[PDB]
Amino acid sequence: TRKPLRAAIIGLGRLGERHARHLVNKIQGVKLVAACALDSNQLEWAKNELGVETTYTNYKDMIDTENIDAIFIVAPTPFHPEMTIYAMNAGLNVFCEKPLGLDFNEVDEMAKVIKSHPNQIFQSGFMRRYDDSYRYAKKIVDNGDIGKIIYMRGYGIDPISGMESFTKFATEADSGGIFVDMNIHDIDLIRWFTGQDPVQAYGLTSNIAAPQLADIGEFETGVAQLKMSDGVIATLIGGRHAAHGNQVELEVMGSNGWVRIGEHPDLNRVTVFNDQGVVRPSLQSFGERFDTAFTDEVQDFVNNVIVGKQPEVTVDDGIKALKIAKACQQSANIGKLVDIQL
Amino acid sequence: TRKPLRAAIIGLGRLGERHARHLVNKIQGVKLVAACALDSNQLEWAKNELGVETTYTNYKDMIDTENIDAIFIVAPTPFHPEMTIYAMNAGLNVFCEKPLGLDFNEVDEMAKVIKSHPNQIFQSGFMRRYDDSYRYAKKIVDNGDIGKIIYMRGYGIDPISGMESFTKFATEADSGGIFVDMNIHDIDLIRWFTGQDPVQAYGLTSNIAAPQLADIGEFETGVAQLKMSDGVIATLIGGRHAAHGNQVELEVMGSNGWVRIGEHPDLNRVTVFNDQGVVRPSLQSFGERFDTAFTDEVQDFVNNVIVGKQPEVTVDDGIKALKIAKACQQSANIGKLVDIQL
Amino acid sequence: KPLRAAIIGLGRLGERHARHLVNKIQGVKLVAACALDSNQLEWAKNELGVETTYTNYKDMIDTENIDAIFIVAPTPFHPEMTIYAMNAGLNVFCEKPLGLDFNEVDEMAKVIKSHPNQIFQSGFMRRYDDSYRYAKKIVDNGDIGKIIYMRGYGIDPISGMESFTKFATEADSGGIFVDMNIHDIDLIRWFTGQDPVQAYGLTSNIAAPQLADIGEFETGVAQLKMSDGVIATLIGGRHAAHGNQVELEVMGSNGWVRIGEHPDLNRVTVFNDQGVVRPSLQSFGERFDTAFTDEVQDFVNNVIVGKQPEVTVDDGIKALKIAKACQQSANIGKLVDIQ
Amino acid sequence: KPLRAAIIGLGRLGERHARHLVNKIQGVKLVAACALDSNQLEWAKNELGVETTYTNYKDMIDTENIDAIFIVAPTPFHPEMTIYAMNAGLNVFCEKPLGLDFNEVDEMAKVIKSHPNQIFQSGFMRRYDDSYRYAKKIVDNGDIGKIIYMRGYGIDPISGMESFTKFATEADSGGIFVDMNIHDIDLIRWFTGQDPVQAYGLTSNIAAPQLADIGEFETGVAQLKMSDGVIATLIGGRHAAHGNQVELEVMGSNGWVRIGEHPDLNRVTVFNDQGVVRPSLQSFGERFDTAFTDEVQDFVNNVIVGKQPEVTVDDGIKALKIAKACQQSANIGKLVDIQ
Ligand SMILES: NC(=O)c1ccc[n+]([C@@H]2O[C@H](COP(=O)([O-])OP(=O)(O)OC[C@H]3O[C@@H](n4cnc5c(N)ncnc54)[C@H](O)[C@@H]3O)[C@@H](O)[C@H]2O)c1
Ligand SMILES: NC(=O)c1ccc[n+]([C@@H]2O[C@H](COP(=O)([O-])OP(=O)(O)OC[C@H]3O[C@@H](n4cnc5c(N)ncnc54)[C@H](O)[C@@H]3O)[C@@H](O)[C@H]2O)c1
Ligand SMILES: NC(=O)c1ccc[n+]([C@@H]2O[C@H](COP(=O)([O-])OP(=O)(O)OC[C@H]3O[C@@H](n4cnc5c(N)ncnc54)[C@H](O)[C@@H]3O)[C@@H](O)[C@H]2O)c1
Ligand SMILES: NC(=O)c1ccc[n+]([C@@H]2O[C@H](COP(=O)([O-])OP(=O)(O)OC[C@H]3O[C@@H](n4cnc5c(N)ncnc54)[C@H](O)[C@@H]3O)[C@@H](O)[C@H]2O)c1
Ligand SMILES: [Cl-]
């Protein structure tokens, strides 16, 4: 029927490889013709196992050489602004993973380049908005079935088994810290659910569970309490040392009923009875938890390019969530309350 | 204020010791004066730990020597009829544990002796009727909150840790088989909930989990299906080899809703997170599960003796439950459907 | 080179299968569609881009250039459609059950057996379900010891009653055991590696007394004796208030597993005046959607690679004979010995 | 030989303590009762068999032959009722909290210390609860590793709003943190062995704007920095739809425990048009009935043997200070340092 979109991908790591698989196997109206990474094994895997034509170690070279309509940026956070700016100037439609970046000026310039190319689609990586459970809860809230929102609590905690791959991820490039890396999703959800902005942050951090993270300037746990512009209160917890699995939980406490999303991170529909009692095995990664969400958001992006429609989640939503996460980290660093400026 | 009832107990085993503890510590308007057991150490325990005045190895000696208003028979099932008859004839009020007996001839004579002493209270031991949860579900059903009952499922499975204490219990005396020992409780519950009687039984037995039980003529598992007098269908499962704990479960499946009682045998209100996932520790015995019900039923008996009122659960209820149980056992042994007449 | 495929039937499950074929399945193109409904065919042509539509399935097989056919028409037509396609060289995916008439199913199996270069696959999708596979891996590893007892539930929500009544008046459903429990029967055989030797069936119409007029039963409860000493219970029903209950309990000598104990819709827990609430799934389609996609993908891959599926025609016959033995037991009011 | 006992207060909790004293507690006789309500006093004399009833507690103490007294009167009377009883050479069980005014509690604590032959026990019943003790056992054994974070919830159902509104118009509750989270603070102090050094509190009246008219807050949320690096959250509330939520999460370095994640009424699972439902507890009393019994039994035992309870007066004072810091933090819109 219609000519499929020609696409390229930067990054083939923890999330990169999942996006690449979906891009080849699951996404309609797209052909992944080029891949870029600094790891030679990942590039060989992209070529031989996935059937991607051309591989690159230089992303600028790829954009300069390849005939592509859209690009997927799944490289580390510090590279996001420069990679996006380069692709936007080349005339490309951009899907960039969260966060937008780390430096405020680098993000602002990125935002300026995006706004100057309105004919090109820019989409961020807040996948939890596409997840069926979060949507279902949002629909309940929008219906008035829990009254007015009083309080929201967000958990985002990786399991102990993920300490090796996170360390590599954080050693090789700045992640922005626990609040920026873990809590940013929850920050967007709170903004989405309430329609309000945080005006004050109290952040506390911890290395009790993993003291060796101090060596690389990381905190194992980040706990933040937020005050919103409308009176709603919030707690955010990011962590890396859960024993059961990947905990991703959102609690929305209303004036007339509550909802809890992902109270237990159940793997499947199987209840196990053993010498421990009654067990529910848990999901061990964010990727297995949000696999469908990752697929649906990317399909949405491809559809956005074809139709010529910008995503509901704006650049400003990415900036605001980043500034808030930074504020929580600032609060912990300085040991003071931080009034959020947006 | 008023003279307490003077009571005695026969048997201080798995259930006897719990009854004796409640009788000294929890039950009001009663004083445990004497105890009878064949175990010397159990009798010493009654004197030294509980403060019981006198001890006996012969129950007839105790009944003919002690000044008592009431007796508690927690001796093995075969001794129930002869102990009840002797105690009834001595003017005593009798609380006898379930079941009434094993031989239909012995139980008939026992029932006749109880009928001939209408001024003396007799009470069986179907404690589940006193349990808070079963009562709650019975109220739900009676209010019509599940519509009309169509199906019921009763599970009564001991944990693997109880295998040693059961073998002791079943080698020293005839327990009456798995359907009589385990499933009798659910039979009573089904009769209670429906107001109907079973007309047909299909029973099947298993020694897969423990083949050594055949050496004492016992079956590890007994599964029975029942046709009720007004349409209802029921399944009963008695077992002795669960890994998680003591499973005691009742499902009432209606035309406009269901209820499940004790779907999981949760020990307490603690949820555990470990390398297994999300865990709920389980109850390990019938005595821990039904501790309150055991207390409440004995208190009801004591009140019944004082006020001069026969309990709701009649002798007829015990006979029928025993008959239906033995019909399930017969069905399994003869490999045929058994039509029940009550 | 993608497979050229046709579909017969665009109903409750037919529309779902056709969607997957177009949107999710790799190595295939849905070239043609056949149904008796004009609206369903227009939906297939407009919304799914199906090139050609037919009311006559035989005319479709004889006109279209196709490699595979998906049979999602009513059960009675399964044998003759499978037979016609097999004799025309096609690869066949046929939905459960194989059929109702034992002779037609034997004739059906004969046509399958005489075309060994052609793939035939049935629709036991629960074997592809992530949860069932997980439990099957647990049992195989010896994590629950030996199986002693299994319990299978298949109960539809009240909302489906008015839908089912209209269908069961005009057509033969095969009965409550055949319709609601055949999946559970296959699962028991799969998990145990053994066959039922005896069956006790009971039926009920307490929840829907109006079904007695159309020779149907609202509830069927069956107790089964396995060849190795394992005991099973099957329940089929049509009057659950909470939603679609599909449950398997596998009781072992050293551990139990339960599959779909509660038919949880998603990961949202609700707190309201009723207490603490988990919303439930309302149809088999929503529950086993991924399974429906995976089995169909498996079939496509089987045709391409030229490999017959694990589940045989014999598996489909046996599960049907077992289900019918349960219905017979209830109807004659007697124990039925199975072989 | 039983201890002769009296009770002051027969309201929401007093009525419960009185019943346990008569029906369940061993080694104690409830001889006298004092309240400002005729109906309550008459209920004590008729349904419980209490000999003498009073409307003045001073008259009761000065007349009755008693060894112990239970103070379940309103909080403003706690300091003066304890001092009056301690001076009378009496063993005192006093409900939470010790008081609302720091000067009155300071004087109260000084009197308690000067009578060391008399037992003083407070009302932190959660330390007697089976579930909290089981979780405390896990934490102590090192079965969750090192504590990193803890979260305490105490939320009353909407049904309880009416009785609270009329009460808080009449008397000072001490604020949402003092009234709803004091148990949780003690629990955190008990589980960690550490003390908070800093508090950030925020309040809300979104659910009940009418409470701002009487200087009350419907919801309070606090974050606490503990002295050795542990982080904690406290939430008190009065507008839950499902029932009484009382929950404690202990997040560790190698495992977590959650106590009372759902406030389950019993062991019954309900299946209806809304899905799978667990009915919830509606009050703190029904949730902690056994805890109330066991602590009062422990007090009686303490008086018999002559052993002071593990929970000290400094525990009740510290917990109160911490809760007040949370309230103050919200009221002034600033962080509060705690010493
Ligand atoms: N949405 C989510 O829940 C989610 C989850 C995980 C990661 N992410 C984001 O996705 C991005 C990638 O995360 P990850 O975990 O896959 O990282 P990773 O460490 O696993 O992999 C990084 C990849 O980027 C490539 N790369 C690094 N520098 C490059 C360079 N300058 N030029 C070209 N390629 C380069 C590497 O070869 C590697 O394949 C991060 O920005 C992260 O914030 C989002
Ligand atoms: N209500 C229930 O849920 C329930 C549960 C378990 C047992 N029971 C019933 O309780 C009875 C005993 O149960 P148990 O598990 O404690 O058995 P047990 O073997 O543990 O204890 C039996 C006790 O009776 C004493 N005894 C045996 N023969 C005696 C004799 N002839 N004269 C005097 N004393 C004698 C023994 O010394 C022993 O202490 C059984 O009849 C059983 O059916 C009921
Ligand atoms: N795997 C499962 O759990 C499962 C679930 C539901 C149904 N099924 C099976 O799928 C089949 C269809 O089920 P359904 O619920 O979709 O039925 P349905 O009534 O909803 O749909 C039947 C479809 O077949 C078409 N059709 C009927 N007769 C035809 C004919 N002679 N020629 C061509 N087309 C014809 C109709 O137009 C209709 O579109 C049944 O055989 C059933 O056994 C399996
Ligand atoms: N342990 C807990 O979790 C918990 C829970 C609720 C209440 N409490 C505490 O218990 C105390 C009472 O609580 P409540 O809810 O039962 O109060 P309430 O209002 O329901 O009852 C007060 C009772 O005290 C009596 N009373 C009032 N003034 C008196 C006076 N000056 N002299 C003699 N009697 C007097 C009244 O007659 C009434 O019976 C409070 O101080 C409260 O802080 C503790
Ligand atoms: Cl938004």
Side-chain angles (χ1 to χ4, degrees), chain D residues 102-106 108-112 114-121:
Chain D
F102 290 132
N103 286 335
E104 291 189 342
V105 172
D106 182 50
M108 176 188 180
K110 272 185 267 186
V111 172
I112 290 159
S114 62
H115 298 82
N117 277 316
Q118 295 149 235
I119 305 293
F120 178 85
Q121 188 157 323

mmCIF file of all heavy atoms in Angstrom, chain D residues 102-121, unseen atoms left out:
data_model
loop_
_atom_site.group_PDB
_atom_site.id
_atom_site.type_symbol
_atom_site.label_atom_id
_atom_site.label_comp_id
_atom_site.label_asym_id
_atom_site.label_seq_id
_atom_site.Cartn_x
_atom_site.Cartn_y
_atom_site.Cartn_z
ATOM 1 N N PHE D 102 3.263 20.251 77.112
ATOM 2 C CA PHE D 102 4.577 19.747 77.531
ATOM 3 C C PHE D 102 4.892 19.977 79.010
ATOM 4 O O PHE D 102 5.535 19.136 79.640
ATOM 5 C CB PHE D 102 5.699 20.324 76.659
ATOM 6 C CG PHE D 102 5.709 19.800 75.245
ATOM 7 C CD1 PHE D 102 5.821 20.677 74.168
ATOM 8 C CD2 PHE D 102 5.630 18.430 74.990
ATOM 9 C CE1 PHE D 102 5.841 20.202 72.859
ATOM 10 C CE2 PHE D 102 5.644 17.946 73.687
ATOM 11 C CZ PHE D 102 5.752 18.833 72.618
ATOM 12 N N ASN D 103 4.449 21.109 79.555
ATOM 13 C CA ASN D 103 4.635 21.401 80.979
ATOM 14 C C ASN D 103 3.875 20.428 81.879
ATOM 15 O O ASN D 103 4.388 20.002 82.915
ATOM 16 C CB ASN D 103 4.241 22.848 81.303
ATOM 17 C CG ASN D 103 5.264 23.865 80.811
ATOM 18 O OD1 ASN D 103 6.447 23.557 80.649
ATOM 19 N ND2 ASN D 103 4.807 25.088 80.578
ATOM 20 N N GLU D 104 2.657 20.079 81.468
ATOM 21 C CA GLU D 104 1.818 19.136 82.206
ATOM 22 C C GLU D 104 2.385 17.717 82.179
ATOM 23 O O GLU D 104 2.313 16.998 83.177
ATOM 24 C CB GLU D 104 0.387 19.144 81.662
ATOM 25 C CG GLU D 104 -0.385 20.429 81.937
ATOM 26 C CD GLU D 104 -1.861 20.326 81.582
ATOM 27 O OE1 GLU D 104 -2.237 19.412 80.812
ATOM 28 O OE2 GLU D 104 -2.647 21.163 82.076
ATOM 29 N N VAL D 105 2.945 17.324 81.035
ATOM 30 C CA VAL D 105 3.568 16.006 80.876
ATOM 31 C C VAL D 105 4.895 15.943 81.638
ATOM 32 O O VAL D 105 5.227 14.920 82.237
ATOM 33 C CB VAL D 105 3.772 15.646 79.376
ATOM 34 C CG1 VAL D 105 4.587 14.368 79.214
ATOM 35 C CG2 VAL D 105 2.429 15.500 78.674
ATOM 36 N N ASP D 106 5.637 17.049 81.611
ATOM 37 C CA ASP D 106 6.891 17.186 82.351
ATOM 38 C C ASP D 106 6.674 16.959 83.848
ATOM 39 O O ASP D 106 7.439 16.234 84.491
ATOM 40 C CB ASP D 106 7.500 18.570 82.100
ATOM 41 C CG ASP D 106 8.835 18.767 82.800
ATOM 42 O OD1 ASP D 106 9.719 17.891 82.667
ATOM 43 O OD2 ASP D 106 9.001 19.809 83.473
ATOM 44 N N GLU D 107 5.622 17.581 84.386
ATOM 45 C CA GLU D 107 5.223 17.414 85.783
ATOM 46 C C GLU D 107 4.745 15.985 86.035
ATOM 47 O O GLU D 107 5.067 15.386 87.061
ATOM 48 C CB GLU D 107 4.117 18.414 86.139
ATOM 49 C CG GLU D 107 3.865 18.582 87.635
ATOM 50 N N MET D 108 3.983 15.454 85.081
ATOM 51 C CA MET D 108 3.471 14.084 85.114
ATOM 52 C C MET D 108 4.599 13.050 85.171
ATOM 53 O O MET D 108 4.551 12.119 85.975
ATOM 54 C CB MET D 108 2.582 13.850 83.889
ATOM 55 C CG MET D 108 2.046 12.445 83.714
ATOM 56 S SD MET D 108 1.153 12.282 81.993
ATOM 57 C CE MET D 108 0.627 10.436 82.117
ATOM 58 N N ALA D 109 5.608 13.232 84.321
ATOM 59 C CA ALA D 109 6.777 12.354 84.280
ATOM 60 C C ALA D 109 7.587 12.402 85.575
ATOM 61 O O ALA D 109 8.107 11.376 86.021
ATOM 62 C CB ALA D 109 7.659 12.702 83.088
ATOM 63 N N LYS D 110 7.691 13.591 86.169
ATOM 64 C CA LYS D 110 8.403 13.768 87.441
ATOM 65 C C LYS D 110 7.725 13.038 88.599
ATOM 66 O O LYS D 110 8.398 12.535 89.499
ATOM 67 C CB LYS D 110 8.579 15.254 87.776
ATOM 68 C CG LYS D 110 9.838 15.871 87.177
ATOM 69 C CD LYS D 110 10.051 17.312 87.633
ATOM 70 C CE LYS D 110 9.441 18.314 86.659
ATOM 71 N NZ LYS D 110 9.779 19.716 87.026
ATOM 72 N N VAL D 111 6.394 12.987 88.565
ATOM 73 C CA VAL D 111 5.611 12.284 89.579
ATOM 74 C C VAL D 111 5.751 10.766 89.406
ATOM 75 O O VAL D 111 5.903 10.035 90.388
ATOM 76 C CB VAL D 111 4.122 12.737 89.565
ATOM 77 C CG1 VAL D 111 3.259 11.869 90.476
ATOM 78 C CG2 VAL D 111 4.009 14.200 89.981
ATOM 79 N N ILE D 112 5.720 10.308 88.155
ATOM 80 C CA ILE D 112 5.890 8.890 87.830
ATOM 81 C C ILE D 112 7.241 8.352 88.318
ATOM 82 O O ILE D 112 7.309 7.255 88.880
ATOM 83 C CB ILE D 112 5.693 8.621 86.311
ATOM 84 C CG1 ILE D 112 4.220 8.811 85.929
ATOM 85 C CG2 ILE D 112 6.148 7.208 85.928
ATOM 86 C CD1 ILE D 112 3.987 9.068 84.452
ATOM 87 N N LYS D 113 8.297 9.139 88.119
ATOM 88 C CA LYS D 113 9.652 8.761 88.531
ATOM 89 C C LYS D 113 9.799 8.692 90.050
ATOM 90 O O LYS D 113 10.573 7.883 90.567
ATOM 91 C CB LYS D 113 10.681 9.731 87.946
ATOM 92 N N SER D 114 9.046 9.534 90.755
ATOM 93 C CA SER D 114 9.112 9.609 92.216
ATOM 94 C C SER D 114 8.310 8.505 92.918
ATOM 95 O O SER D 114 8.375 8.366 94.141
ATOM 96 C CB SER D 114 8.680 10.996 92.709
ATOM 97 O OG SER D 114 7.337 11.274 92.357
ATOM 98 N N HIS D 115 7.558 7.728 92.142
ATOM 99 C CA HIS D 115 6.861 6.556 92.663
ATOM 100 C C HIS D 115 7.281 5.310 91.877
ATOM 101 O O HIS D 115 6.510 4.810 91.056
ATOM 102 C CB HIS D 115 5.340 6.746 92.592
ATOM 103 C CG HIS D 115 4.827 7.890 93.413
ATOM 104 N ND1 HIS D 115 4.851 9.195 92.971
ATOM 105 C CD2 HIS D 115 4.260 7.920 94.642
ATOM 106 C CE1 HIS D 115 4.332 9.982 93.896
ATOM 107 N NE2 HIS D 115 3.964 9.232 94.921
ATOM 108 N N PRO D 116 8.502 4.795 92.132
ATOM 109 C CA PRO D 116 9.041 3.682 91.345
ATOM 110 C C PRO D 116 8.505 2.311 91.774
ATOM 111 O O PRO D 116 8.664 1.329 91.045
ATOM 112 C CB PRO D 116 10.554 3.767 91.595
ATOM 113 C CG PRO D 116 10.763 4.927 92.553
ATOM 114 C CD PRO D 116 9.446 5.208 93.181
ATOM 115 N N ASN D 117 7.882 2.252 92.948
ATOM 116 C CA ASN D 117 7.221 1.040 93.423
ATOM 117 C C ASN D 117 5.883 0.796 92.735
ATOM 118 O O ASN D 117 5.343 -0.312 92.779
ATOM 119 C CB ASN D 117 7.024 1.098 94.938
ATOM 120 C CG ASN D 117 8.260 0.678 95.699
ATOM 121 O OD1 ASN D 117 8.909 -0.311 95.356
ATOM 122 N ND2 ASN D 117 8.585 1.422 96.748
ATOM 123 N N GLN D 118 5.352 1.840 92.109
ATOM 124 C CA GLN D 118 4.102 1.742 91.371
ATOM 125 C C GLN D 118 4.387 1.621 89.882
ATOM 126 O O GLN D 118 5.282 2.287 89.354
ATOM 127 C CB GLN D 118 3.216 2.956 91.656
ATOM 128 C CG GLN D 118 2.753 3.047 93.108
ATOM 129 C CD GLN D 118 2.556 4.475 93.576
ATOM 130 O OE1 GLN D 118 3.132 4.892 94.579
ATOM 131 N NE2 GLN D 118 1.740 5.233 92.853
ATOM 132 N N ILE D 119 3.628 0.757 89.218
ATOM 133 C CA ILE D 119 3.787 0.519 87.788
ATOM 134 C C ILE D 119 3.075 1.605 86.981
ATOM 135 O O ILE D 119 1.911 1.921 87.241
ATOM 136 C CB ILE D 119 3.250 -0.890 87.379
ATOM 137 C CG1 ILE D 119 3.904 -2.004 88.218
ATOM 138 C CG2 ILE D 119 3.411 -1.139 85.871
ATOM 139 C CD1 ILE D 119 5.405 -2.214 87.981
ATOM 140 N N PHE D 120 3.788 2.184 86.019
ATOM 141 C CA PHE D 120 3.155 3.035 85.017
ATOM 142 C C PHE D 120 3.322 2.461 83.609
ATOM 143 O O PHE D 120 4.443 2.277 83.129
ATOM 144 C CB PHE D 120 3.672 4.477 85.075
ATOM 145 C CG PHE D 120 3.073 5.367 84.017
ATOM 146 C CD1 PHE D 120 1.852 6.000 84.231
ATOM 147 C CD2 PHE D 120 3.718 5.548 82.795
ATOM 148 C CE1 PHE D 120 1.285 6.808 83.248
ATOM 149 C CE2 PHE D 120 3.158 6.353 81.806
ATOM 150 C CZ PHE D 120 1.940 6.985 82.034
ATOM 151 N N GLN D 121 2.194 2.193 82.957
ATOM 152 C CA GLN D 121 2.180 1.662 81.598
ATOM 153 C C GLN D 121 1.323 2.541 80.686
ATOM 154 O O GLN D 121 0.232 2.965 81.073
ATOM 155 C CB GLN D 121 1.666 0.218 81.601
ATOM 156 C CG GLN D 121 1.792 -0.507 80.265
ATOM 157 C CD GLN D 121 1.825 -2.017 80.410
ATOM 158 O OE1 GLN D 121 2.401 -2.551 81.360
ATOM 159 N NE2 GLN D 121 1.219 -2.714 79.455
#
